[PDB]
């Protein structure tokens, strides 16, 4: 047993490792979206940069779980970071729809971890999730939803002028 | 009788109370429009902010009537602030049309109060309305009218691209 | 269903709408207290300003619930803002006693909403209440209680000199 | 006829001369109150200074009528400035009560002049009164009324401690 460990259930330790894999997976998916929108035959550079920044944010989310694990006396266990679901992302609307789904998948995992922490009576882990993850997730989901609404209003996927306008005025 | 009261008719005192209720009602209607345009399935944030700011301005208009009432020795009497006419506002054009009508309703009430003040030979109340309310109202009506003209030019309600453009360049 | 909605129970959505009505009601009550203390036959301007500021704070509390509702994918539904319980507030002690009761009523509603959020397993809503509302409420209640103690010490309601002193040194 | 004169009735010209005498009379009354509160056996120096400043303001009101008369092509005609009604002013409450009455007398004269200007269809004179005199008068009356309320609360005339407190915290 780690000398620092106190009130930290094995199940929570394992679930933190799984959560940080998922954050890394989200990072990698956003990296793929960046690369897609930077293609010469896609060429929506503000959209690309949005996804690049979000890739970096997800990596920070993962690193914060690594630090957390060690603070509690758990042990970081890494697994493969699976490649993203798609190799190409269609257009801004399709990518934003995939991003919304990804953020809701990550949110569900965070909520499930909070429920586990609640079941194991771990207020420190509950606070960490509430203070560092859950509100950021709600904000991200709202932002992407707002973007999807605007992309639909702009006539995506068919309206290329609308797609151009979005890249130049929303991001 | 209040020790400060001079040349202040009971009818004017009552009409000032009614006017400040109407200013509060206008504030509340603009708050509703703010909340509508901030919905994830509406997502026109500059439009939302326009209405939020106008909600705050109307509250200031009400507070100025409260202060006025006390300066003249009248007594502020509050009534319920009725909820807005609609729970949802359609789109930017529909909301701006409702805002125009609301501003003209408020203007008519201000003009009616000026006529009452004139009938009761109350130059202080006439000056207050002329100096603090009537020109602001004309300016607000002109601004909203100009917006409606532009929204129609942009093809509202059908043209979603036009609605997007308005939010990004007019507000 | 809103595209952003996740883990947000209908009951919580409705209770958030009710809570923001109550915040608006509290704002309106404080506006009435402001107007009372600004009367020429009351004339306690620092007390009046205390209540005016608190009216503005309550409006901010309401607006934050509107934003919250939209972030979660709920829909803001407004109701009439009822006029305050009284048209005149007696004196500083009576008004502060009414303010204490109002703050405890608002606090109870916040606590009840937290219990609902707990029952529906909504940690985001719990965190929002804990981080943005519950401590502010405890602080406000303590401040008003401290004022009441001092007003009683100063001989309110009978001791007009004590009432004057409070306005000049406590607020 | 003055080369500049246009739409300026003889009756209005005469009433402007009477009004500026009354402003000078008000100035002189406030000078007397200053001197009273500066007596070694009265010795309320902040009260004295309040009245001295108000004496200066009334002189400015008179001078503005002189300038007005000449701008319109009327001719300033001066009369004696009558000495104040009293040689001694009792105490702060008695003096403030006399000041309230004086301000309401001046206000009535301004309102009567506005009615004359209205009857003679002189919008320039109406505007001058509304823009330069009537609101200042309402403000002054409200301020003095608020002071009287506080002096009564403080137990004037009998409560010397209350009178001291007023001088040290209200003025
Ligand atoms: Cl442990
Ligand atoms: Cl424990
Ligand atoms: Cl364990
Ligand atoms: Cl593991
Ligand atoms: Cl894993
Ligand atoms: Cl942290
Ligand atoms: Cl694996
Ligand atoms: Cl693919
Ligand atoms: Cl997903
Ligand atoms: Cl879990
Ligand atoms: Cl939970
Ligand atoms: Cl967070
Ligand atoms: Cl957006
Ligand atoms: Cl289209
Ligand atoms: Cl198209
Ligand atoms: Cl957008
Ligand atoms: Cl009257
Ligand atoms: Cl009159
Ligand atoms: Cl009347
Ligand atoms: Cl009324
Ligand atoms: Cl009303
Ligand atoms: Cl004003
Ligand atoms: Cl009603
Ligand atoms: Cl509706
Ligand atoms: Cl209307
Ligand atoms: Cl009216
Ligand atoms: Cl009129
Ligand atoms: Cl104006
Ligand atoms: Cl325009
Ligand atoms: Cl069109
Ligand atoms: Cl169209
Ligand atoms: Cl425009
Ligand atoms: Cl849900
Ligand atoms: Cl859940
Ligand atoms: Cl539900
Ligand atoms: Cl509801
Ligand atoms: Cl309600
Ligand atoms: Cl917040
Ligand atoms: Cl209701
Ligand atoms: Cl009452
Ligand atoms: Cl209550
Ligand atoms: Cl509840
Ligand atoms: Cl609870
Ligand atoms: Cl708080
Ligand atoms: Cl205290
Ligand atoms: Cl006592
Ligand atoms: Cl007493
Ligand atoms: Cl205190
Ligand atoms: Cl002439
Ligand atoms: Cl003419
Ligand atoms: Cl003539
Ligand atoms: Cl003359
Ligand atoms: Cl004279
Ligand atoms: Cl001038
Ligand atoms: Cl004479
Ligand atoms: Cl005398
Ligand atoms: Cl007099
Ligand atoms: Cl006259
Ligand atoms: Cl008149
Ligand atoms: Cl003025
Ligand atoms: Cl005062
Ligand atoms: Cl006393
Ligand atoms: Cl006494
Ligand atoms: Cl003191
Ligand atoms: Cl005072
Ligand atoms: Fe996983
Ligand atoms: Fe993340
Ligand atoms: Fe694979
Ligand atoms: Fe994310
Ligand atoms: Fe009304
Ligand atoms: Fe208004
Ligand atoms: Fe109704
Ligand atoms: Fe308005
Ligand atoms: Fe309620
Ligand atoms: Fe509140
Ligand atoms: Fe009622
Ligand atoms: Fe409160
Ligand atoms: Fe005279
Ligand atoms: Fe004057
Ligand atoms: Fe005489
Ligand atoms: Fe004066
Ligand atoms: Fe003091
Ligand atoms: Mg060891
Ligand atoms: Mg283990
Ligand atoms: Mg937080
Ligand atoms: Mg946004
Ligand atoms: Mg096309
Ligand atoms: Mg009285
Ligand atoms: Mg009446
Ligand atoms: Mg007329
Ligand atoms: Mg103006
Ligand atoms: Mg313009
Ligand atoms: Mg269309
Ligand atoms: Mg939808
Ligand atoms: Mg529902
Ligand atoms: Mg629990
Ligand atoms: Mg806190
Ligand atoms: Mg304290
Ligand atoms: Mg007493
Ligand atoms: Mg000549
Ligand atoms: Mg003549
Ligand atoms: Mg003015
Ligand atoms: Mg004042
Ligand atoms: Mg005595």
């Amino acid at each position: 047993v780690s000398q620092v460990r106190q009130n930290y259930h094995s199940d929570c330790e394992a679930a933190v490792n799984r959560m940080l894999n998922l954050e890394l997976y989200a990072s990698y998916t956003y990296s793929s979206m960046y690369a897609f929108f930077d293609r010469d035959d896609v060429a929506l550079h503000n959209v690309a940069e949005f996804f690049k920044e979000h890739s970096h944010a997800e990596r920070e989310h993962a690193e914060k779980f690594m630090k957390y694990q060690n603070k509690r006396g758990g042990r970081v266990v890494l697994q493969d970071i699976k490649k993203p679901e798609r190799d190409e992302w269609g257009n801004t609307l399709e990518a934003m729809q995939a991003a919304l789904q990804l953020e809701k998948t990550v949110n569900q995992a965070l909520l499930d971890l909070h429920k586990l922490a609640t079941d194991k009576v771990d207020p420190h882990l509950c606070d960490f999730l509430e203070s560092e993850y859950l509100e950021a997730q709600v904000k991200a989901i709202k932002r992407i939803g707002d973007f999807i609404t605007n992309l639909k209003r702009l006539g995506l996927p068919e309206n290329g002028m609308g797609e151009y306008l979005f890249d130049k005025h929303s991001v």
Side-chain angles (χ1 to χ4, degrees), chain A residues 1-58 60-84 86-114 116-171:
Chain A
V1 68
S2 162
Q3 72 193 322
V4 305
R5 198 193 189 103
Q6 184 171 28
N7 194 40
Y8 193 50
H9 199 281
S10 180
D11 294 359
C12 296
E13 174 181 358
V16 163
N17 285 326
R18 293 193 297 273
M19 192 68 231
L20 82 92
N21 185 267
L22 182 58
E23 298 286 0
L24 293 169
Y25 176 83
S27 179
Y28 201 28
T29 287
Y30 283 133
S31 198
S32 179
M33 295 183 181
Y34 155 69
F36 178 77
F37 288 99
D38 181 69
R39 287 168 54 158
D40 76 90
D41 61 8
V42 181
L44 294 161
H45 289 291
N46 296 327
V47 175
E49 291 303 325
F50 172 86
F51 291 125
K52 184 171 186 186
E53 289 166 0
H54 285 41
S55 178
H56 296 175
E58 298 299 345
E60 294 173 332
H61 299 169
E63 287 177 327
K64 187 178 289 178
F65 277 119
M66 292 195 289
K67 185 177 174 198
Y68 185 86
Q69 188 74 283
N70 281 332
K71 283 167 69 172
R72 295 297 301 276
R75 297 291 165 247
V76 172
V77 178
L78 300 177
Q79 302 296 342
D80 295 348
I81 307 163
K82 300 293 205 178
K83 71 197 183 76
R86 293 178 56 175
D87 297 317
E88 63 78 26
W89 297 99
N91 58 64
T92 307
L93 174 61
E94 285 194 19
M96 288 293 178
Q97 285 167 150
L100 180 63
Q101 190 178 10
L102 175 66
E103 293 298 313
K104 296 184 83 181
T105 295
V106 171
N107 200 34
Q108 190 62 61
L110 291 162
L111 292 169
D112 291 350
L113 182 53
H114 193 282
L116 178 63
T118 296
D119 293 351
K120 301 305 191 185
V121 199
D122 191 335
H124 187 270
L125 178 52
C126 286
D127 166 81
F128 177 63
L129 295 170
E130 289 166 53
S131 300
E132 303 299 322
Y133 292 85
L134 295 185
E135 163 60 14
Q137 211 72 24
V138 160
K139 281 186 172 103
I141 290 164
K142 177 61 159 68
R143 187 170 189 203
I144 294 161
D146 289 354
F147 286 162
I148 292 164
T149 295
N150 279 283
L151 290 157
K152 290 178 174 185
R153 160 185 295 125
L154 283 164
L156 276 282
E158 299 90 347
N159 200 315
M161 180 183 290
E163 192 164 12
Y164 178 86
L165 289 171
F166 178 90
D167 171 276
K168 295 301 188 180
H169 305 80
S170 290
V171 276

